[PDB]
Amino acid sequence: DAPLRFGANYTPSKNWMHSWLDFTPDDVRRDFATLAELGLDHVRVFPLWTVLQPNRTLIREKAIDDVRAVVDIAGEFGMDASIDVVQGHLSSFDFVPSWLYTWHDKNMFTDPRALEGQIALVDRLGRALSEAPNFLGLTLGNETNQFSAHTHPSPWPVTQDEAGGWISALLSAAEAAAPGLPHVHSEYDAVWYMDGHGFTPAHASRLGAMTTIHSWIFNGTAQRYGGRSVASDRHAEYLIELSRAFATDPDRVVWLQEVGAPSNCLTDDEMPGFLEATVRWAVRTENLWGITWWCSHDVSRDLGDFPELEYTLGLIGQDGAAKPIGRRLAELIPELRQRVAPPARDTAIVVDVDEREVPVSRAALSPGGAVFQAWVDACAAGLDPTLVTSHDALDPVALDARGIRRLIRPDL
Amino acid sequence: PLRFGANYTPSKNWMHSWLDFTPDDVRRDFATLAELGLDHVRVFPLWTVLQPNRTLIREKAIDDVRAVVDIAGEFGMDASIDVVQGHLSSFDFVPSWLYTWHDKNMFTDPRALEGQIALVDRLGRALSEAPNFLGLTLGNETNQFSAHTHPSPWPVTQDEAGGWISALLSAAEAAAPGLPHVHSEYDAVWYMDGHGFTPAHASRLGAMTTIHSWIFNGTAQRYGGRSVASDRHAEYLIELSRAFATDPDRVVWLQEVGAPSNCLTDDEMPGFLEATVRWAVRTENLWGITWWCSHDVSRDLGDFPELEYTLGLIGQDGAAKPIGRRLAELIPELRQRVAPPARDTAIVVDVDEREVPVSRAALSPGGAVFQAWVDACAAGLDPTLVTSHDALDPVALDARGIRRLIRPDL
Numbered sequence A: 001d002a003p004l005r006f007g008a009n010y011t012p013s014k015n016w017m018h019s020w021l022d023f024t025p026d027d028v029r030r031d032f033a034t035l036a037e038l039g040l041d042h043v044r045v046f047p048l049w050t051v052l053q054p055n056r057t058l059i060r061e062k063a064i065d066d067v068r069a070v071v072d073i074a075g076e077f078g079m080d081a082s083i084d085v086v087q088g089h090l091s092s093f094d095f096v097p098s099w100l101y102t103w104h105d106k107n108m109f110t111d112p113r114a115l116e117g118q119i120a121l122v123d124r125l126g127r128a129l130s131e132a133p134n135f136l137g138l139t140l141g142n143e144t145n146q147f148s149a150h151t152h153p154s155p156w157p158v159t160q161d162e163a164g165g166w167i168s169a170l171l172s173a174a175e176a177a178a179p180g181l182p183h184v185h186s187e188y189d190a191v192w193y194m195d196g197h198g199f200t201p202a203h204a205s206r207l208g209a210m211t212t213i214h215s216w217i218f219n220g221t222a223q224r225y226g227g228r229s230v231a232s233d234r235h236a237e238y239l240i241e242l243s244r245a246f247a248t249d250p251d252r253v254v255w256l257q258e259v260g261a262p263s264n265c266l267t268d269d270e271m272p273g274f275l276e277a278t279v280r281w282a283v284r285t286e287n288l289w290g291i292t293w294w295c296s297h298d299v300s301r302d303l304g305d306f307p308e309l310e311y312t313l314g315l316i317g318q319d320g321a322a323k324p325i326g327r328r329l330a331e332l333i334p335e336l337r338q339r340v341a342p343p344a345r346d347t348a349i350v351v352d353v354d355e356r357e358v359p360v361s362r363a364a365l366s367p368g369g370a371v372f373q374a375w376v377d378a379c380a381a382g383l384d385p386t387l388v389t390s391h392d393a394l395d396p397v398a399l400d401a402r403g404i405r406r407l408i409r410p411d412l
Numbered sequence B: 001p002l003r004f005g006a007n008y009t010p011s012k013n014w015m016h017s018w019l020d021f022t023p024d025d026v027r028r029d030f031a032t033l034a035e036l037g038l039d040h041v042r043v044f045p046l047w048t049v050l051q052p053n054r055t056l057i058r059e060k061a062i063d064d065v066r067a068v069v070d071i072a073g074e075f076g077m078d079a080s081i082d083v084v085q086g087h088l089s090s091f092d093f094v095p096s097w098l099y100t101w102h103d104k105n106m107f108t109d110p111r112a113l114e115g116q117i118a119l120v121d122r123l124g125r126a127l128s129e130a131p132n133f134l135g136l137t138l139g140n141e142t143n144q145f146s147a148h149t150h151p152s153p154w155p156v157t158q159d160e161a162g163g164w165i166s167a168l169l170s171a172a173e174a175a176a177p178g179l180p181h182v183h184s185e186y187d188a189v190w191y192m193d194g195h196g197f198t199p200a201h202a203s204r205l206g207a208m209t210t211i212h213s214w215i216f217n218g219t220a221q222r223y224g225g226r227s228v229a230s231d232r233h234a235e236y237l238i239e240l241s242r243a244f245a246t247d248p249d250r251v252v253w254l255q256e257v258g259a260p261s262n263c264l265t266d267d268e269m270p271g272f273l274e275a276t277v278r279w280a281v282r283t284e285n286l287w288g289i290t291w292w293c294s295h296d297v298s299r300d301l302g303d304f305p306e307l308e309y310t311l312g313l314i315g316q317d318g319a320a321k322p323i324g325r326r327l328a329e330l331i332p333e334l335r336q337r338v339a340p341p342a343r344d345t346a347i348v349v350d351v352d353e354r355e356v357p358v359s360r361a362a363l364s365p366g367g368a369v370f371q372a373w374v375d376a377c378a379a380g381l382d383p384t385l386v387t388s389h390d391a392l393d394p395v396a397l398d399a400r401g402i403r404r405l406i407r408p409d410l
Helices: A016-022 A026-036 A061-076 A112-129 A159-176 A201-205 A221-223 A237-246 A268-285 A308-310 A322-336 A368-382 A398-403 B014-020 B021-036 B060-074 B108-127 B140-146 B158-175 B199-204 B219-223 B231-241 B266-281 B305-311 B323-334 B368-378 B394-399
Strands: A005-009 A042-045 A080-084 A134-138 A211-215 A254-259 A288-293 A347-351 A387-390 A405-410 B003-007 B038-041 B078-084 B134-137 B209-213 B252-257 B285-289 B345-347 B382-389 B404-406
Touching: A016 B060, A026 A061, A042 A061, A042 A221, A042 A288, A061 A080, A061 A112, A061 B014, A112 A134, A112 A159, A159 A201, A201 A211, A201 A237, A211 A237, A237 A254, A237 A347, A237 A387, A254 A268, A268 A288, A268 A322, A288 B252, A347 A368, B003 B323, B003 B345, B021 B078, B021 B108, B038 B060, B078 B345, B108 B134, B108 B158, B108 B345, B134 B158, B158 B199, B199 B231, B209 B231, B231 B252, B231 B266, B231 B345, B231 B382, B252 B266, B266 B285, B266 B323, B345 B368
Parallel strands: A005 A042, A005 A288, A042 A080, A080 A134, A211 A254, A254 A288, A347 A387, A347 A405, B003 B038, B003 B285, B038 B078, B078 B134, B209 B252, B252 B285, B345 B382, B345 B404
Antiparallel strands: none
């Protein structure tokens, strides 16, 4: 199997995503040179929906050309590039074109006109990027399910059918525009942790070409267990194995598409050790595609209203130099690049599911929950657990397929 | 000397052209307008381009606005700029830092106010150096964000609306001294009961009263596209604004007026322009008329209300349309300022102790005061309006030569 991939979610050092408004190739080059110096082999890139498609029937060739230029500039440094189509959500900010706003408000997931416009955007963008030999594939959009969550201040709600329907429509457009590439979709961890959410673990584990994972210890994990702890260090691995439970493809590949070291969870001195612990833990999982760190560069303090933790997630500082977490990752990449046989994991923690294969209690999976604690306790007891649904837990065919020998049924 | 201009709507990709600013496209549009004899344009940068983060006011975005002003000058024209769009032609452009997780009332939130003050300051300082820069309008119909009919209103009391207006105007005055800076409401300010922006705000704050006159507000529907009520609607709002002015030399700017296709057939569009222009210039201390709009909106841009597409003086083919030809014929006849007619008969607007109309609905199309205006015009009068306070003041009436009061019922 292929070597493990290591990359960074690209957050432009100069003016962040707003730099798309005055696209400057040499700024991208300077940013990418620092990333290439760490040994990174790919970047994840975020165009803005407000720039790509400011009117439903105006998909701007000039904006798509700028995205292709970023892909080409990554190639100059021998890096590949994946592109998220619909932003959509980034770092607490929502970029929504005016044709889905106020007088034009429409549910981006279920409105036929919004769906037709996103299909057309995926087609135009995918077709332009498919020419590039270093273009990896499309992600539908960053954490786009956050628009549907009941915690969102103005949600666009979806049923489970509706969420899968949006995912499949856009994936079908991506396959038509850029065939043969591994197009995916991306939820934040409400997909695993939020009861009643329309996007389901099955969606994440079964739809798209690989399972994507966003692992963020500011989700209550560090607050309950400590920044440097079993629970925090192995959180990404927890979501990976939890996703495995809901996969129907035995060869399903997992992409740790976002993981970072936030300053409200870790002191500055703890951050290199956390990166190393997280990276080493996730590499010891089966069929991992690679790890994409959040993020490439610190956010400029010239920009206001970001949550405080967003500013210092970079591998590279605003002074242009690699930060301690960047240097640590650069040391680990050659050590961990070549793939090795993964651990056995014969002990599974069962996740009770309902008829629709949705967990009975996603809260139990969330930090502090009965299933989450069972994972923490098993890890702290030196085991390497995995997880199974209560359906599979009674199927000795499915159990023997994964070599599962001991079950752990958490209390409630 | 009366001024005639157009609200600039770029032919190529409309306001979205700011995302790939192209001077030579502005030049082609503006040559078309100068050929009509127009002497000024009104220009709309986008809030999302100018200020995508609260503390990133983009020098390049502002340089492009200055470039549009300079290109106007290449064709002998002046330019006025609206600072905060904000609202344009059914679409709202709001930066992500006032949206969802960052939603804040743009009129009352201290950081949003500070961000707008700063934006007004930076645009004013950059434009003040151009000899053909007329001044700033705070924003196009920005009061619509506070209306109870808005899908997601940012409500304001009367005091809060006045405070937002005055705060941004003070910023404009400091950044571009000696120029007239104004604010702009759509006609809820005149017609909508309970609305936070008041007639007093429009007629007293800022250097000139601005008027947005749109006969699709119920006027043409009730009375007909070509009618007494529709032809003289801009004139009605002008004289209604006069009733609420406390400055006897208050000047009025018909900043927006157009001929919408849902109210007027194509054949009656030139006649409507002529009737409205001729009506409005017969008012006292009119600064000028700025037509909506310069250019038809491209049909490759979707989801506009249908009437928006054909409001231009110039077609998408780059040629003058019949309404554009008619305006060009009228301009040389009406540039020379003439003394306006006497208006010795005034219709009374009952006002409360805060000088807000008791019933702004009565002022709206079909309302009792609106009807009284239409009737008095049909009677061969040139009416004006007066508050019930001034109607009981002989000195206020004499200062305006008002001899007879008309009091409508209910």
